[PDB]
Symmetry: C3
């Protein structure tokens, strides 16, 4: 599945397999009828946004998140691009990456993804969410139930094609 | 385009350019009024799920498809992660990878993708599917017809923006 | 974000952050009610479709844009595949990279993307487009306003979850 990093609303960990929505630019478990943006994933073969949309790195970024380049001219007349230094950045500091921060989550946005399900979820039907757990509904397609629901677990697991 | 591997329902080859849907977790050619999940693609630059959701491999995976890591402690107290071997794994019996099996197909899920079209399909419009071949409809956007439909070809080709 | 290269209508340059649509298979700024396919992006990094649907290159492609491979056999019985050269390819022309051509644009299709906004755009709501600039509407989800709208600029910037 194809994924990006998002921060949780309360900074706490949302476990693998929960369906999430956005609230105030941050993720929380989705509730019924809310826009489901994706699922917390451990299988993402492609993850993105590890250094995206943060203006506290080594080089200065523009308002769109792009690196700002200076056009440098040499004495001969050769012109080349050089990134602008960020005054804030400390070359001798060890910054903590998103993968080591509990509030930052890999969210699968597209592809076949494992999802927590209740007892109502059926192969070949869609889903909605209650407390981040799939219930029978109209979003996406359930591919197969790989771990049947158990009363004593409180959930089962299905592969869902998320788009 | 961005793609994943899916298995065909009958275990036979679906040729490139056909629109596909899911039935019982496997792919077949899409028909009237069905959810079109994507297109068999030869142009995918990113392709995923080659070894996803394999619970009979060498390394143990959890119910969500993630690798289960042992927490290992050195004599000093230093801790690190180590994959857990699978008890149900048998190195004796044969295994051929998905990429080498005919039943496993690259399905483009997102991006500009070439699609088989009928005589009703028009640039700038959406498509539906009949026998996996695009017909004038409501899904996606036709970017350009690259091979016009002719009779006795039975199809033409268009680039479609699939999302 | 996940992005692909698209050619612009009339070879026009479209700056970062503008919402785009397709017209005759080429991109232009989106207007009210039009289908928004994505946003001009500087945050995509690695971008698909640099070679996709180029029937004017060094190797021959089939009608679906897939590379055509010839089956080669050696004297000693070994079989392998190799791309079929295009005999109508002239290496003397020195073809120019997609990135140095004004008409080719990186369009973010999926993920968290910075978008130009007007004064009506609100966190947690969707957007429509006027001259490629977001206005309050029904598409996507505004994650957060990172640069509030100002008179001095005539726009603000928000991170929008595009799917």
């Amino acid at each position: 599945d194809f994924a990006e990093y998002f921060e949780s609303l309360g900074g706490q960990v949302i476990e693998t397999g929960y369906l999430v929505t956005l609230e105030k630019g941050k993720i929380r478990k989705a509730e019924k009828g809310e826009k489901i943006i994706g699922v917390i994933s451990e299988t993402a073969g492609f993850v993105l946004g590890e250094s995206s949309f943060e203006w506290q790195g080594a080089v200065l970024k523009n308002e769109f998140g792009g690196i700002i380049y200076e056009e440098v001219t040499t004495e001969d007349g050769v012109k080349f691009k050089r990134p602008l230094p960020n005054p804030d950045f400390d070359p001798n500091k060890n910054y903590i990456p998103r993968s080591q921060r509990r509030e930052w989550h890999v969210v699968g946005l597209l592809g076949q993804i494992a999802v927590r399900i209740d007892e109502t979820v059926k192969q070949g039907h869609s889903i909605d969410a209650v407390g981040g757990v799939a219930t029978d509904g109209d979003n996406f397609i359930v591919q197969e139930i790989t771990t049947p629901y158990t009363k004593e677990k409180g959930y089962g697991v299905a592969i869902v094609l998320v788009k």
